[PDB]
Design a protein around this nucleic acid. Structure first.
Ligand SMILES: Nc1ncnc2c1ncn2[C@H]1CC[C@@H](COP(=O)(O)OP(=O)(O)O)O1
Ligand SMILES: [Ca+2]
Ligand SMILES: [Mg+2]
Length: 341
DNA sequence: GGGGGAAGGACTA
DNA sequence: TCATTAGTCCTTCCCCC
């Protein structure tokens, strides 16, 4: 198999630069303003001029401003980025029928039936990068390899505005030399448990007793890492179908007062229903982020679709369960709908 | 023993 | 007054066959 992965560069910030070219070359920070206080919220993404200085996805907006007080700070306009993304995803459909849209700015294309080798794969990558630049003036990074994982790693290595092929020989080299924390699916918690076992490279999972690996990181992650290390990882590119749709908002102030929480919960339901657009969910979950930042949730599955009115009444009973079973104050509240008919 | 659900846990972008 | 938003797959605990 030959997989070609496309990863749009610093996407939300790049879209803002396309819509306002005077922003080019300047640090641009796209933020999720929570409304609690002046600049409360976090950075969704920043362009590379901003990242060079440490301003990146995830940090508090107030911290970003301490580092780059004069950067351009813009509020996230998700619908705009989603419309631009949808147009780019339609351009990709022309290069393969087998495409897995992984997120708003990533797609995997199985081009095995389209090219004969990596030289042709690389040329198709350039064609794709050019097509997207021509139509939308958006740069992207292409990663190419024998499976999804390494195609993604190739993109991580080459972004931004790059293209890279990780051939069979390099895959073998990476299995020996790539820091295992850089393998997709291995976050800080798993990376720490692996460091602690002396596992710093994929190759190392082949010499540890399987049960010892599994006991520390779980059966699925152990089998995953071992299959990559044996160069036997096989996961097909498959059309993705959304399995859940939801909305979670931040409250002005923390609370565990039902009447004070309701308006936020109801606004989350209204927005979620708008997003469902014709999809009819059989399940609803109320999700709360507590003051200390833990996530708590309660849900219910019905034998039939949930009308908006049933969503309103059931969300209140589920929120009560959360309040009745957890004594902490709530910071963010929302709903998630799933099990579509 | 293990299918299936609810809720938490990690991780991703 | 640091700490968003959204979605996916896995683990754990429990009921149940
Ligand atoms: N921490 C985050 N919170 C919210 N959105 C995020 C976060 N991290 C990434 N994203 C979203 C926003 C832009 C979209 C793609 O990200 P971007 O292209 O900037 O990532 P990268 O440069 O790593 O490719 O993913
Ligand atoms: Ca990207
Ligand atoms: Mg990592």
């Amino acid at each position: 198999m030959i997989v070609l992965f496309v990863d749009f560069d610093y996407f939300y910030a790049q879209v803002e630069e396309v819509l306002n070219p005077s922003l080019k070359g300047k640090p641009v920070v796209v933020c999720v303003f929570s409304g609690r206080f002046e600049d409360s919220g976090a950075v969704a993404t920043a362009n590379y001029e901003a990242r060079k200085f440490g301003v990146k996805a995830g940090i508090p907006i107030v911290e970003a401003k301490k580092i780059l007080p004069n950067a351009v700070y813009l509020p996230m306009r998700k619908e705009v980025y989603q419309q631009v993304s949808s147009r780019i995803m339609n351009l990709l459909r022309e290069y393969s029928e087998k495409i897995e849209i992984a997120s708003i700015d990533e797609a995997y294309l199985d081009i095995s039936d389209k090219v004969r080798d990596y030289r042709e794969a690389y040329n198709l990558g350039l064609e794709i990068k050019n097509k997207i630049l021509e139509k939308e003036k958006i740069t992207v990074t292409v990663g190419i390899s024998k499976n999804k994982v390494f195609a993604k790693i190739a993109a991580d290595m080459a972004k931004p505005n790059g293209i890279k092929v990780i051939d069979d020989e390099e895959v073998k080299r990476l299995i020996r030399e790539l820091d295992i924390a850089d393998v997709p699916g291995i976050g800080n918690i798993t990376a720490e448990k692996l460091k602690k076992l002396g596992i710093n490279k994929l190759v190392d999972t082949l010499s540890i007793e399987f049960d010892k690996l599994k006991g520390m990181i779980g059966e699925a992650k152990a089998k995953y890492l071992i299959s990559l290390a044996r160069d036997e990882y096989n996961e097909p590119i498959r059309t993705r179908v959304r399995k859940s749709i939801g909305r979670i908002v931040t409250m002005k102030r923390n609370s565990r007062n039902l009447e004070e929480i309701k308006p936020y919960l109801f606004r989350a339901i209204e927005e979620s229903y708008y997003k469902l657009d014709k999809r009819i969910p059989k399940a609803i979950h109320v999700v709360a982020v507590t003051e200390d930042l833990d996530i708590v949730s309660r849900g219910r599955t019905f034998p039939h679709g949930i009308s908006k009115e049933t969503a309103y009444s059931e969300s209140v009973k589920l929120l009560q369960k959360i309040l009745e079973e957890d004594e902490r104050k709530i910071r963010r509240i929302g709903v998630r709908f799933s099990k579509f008919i």
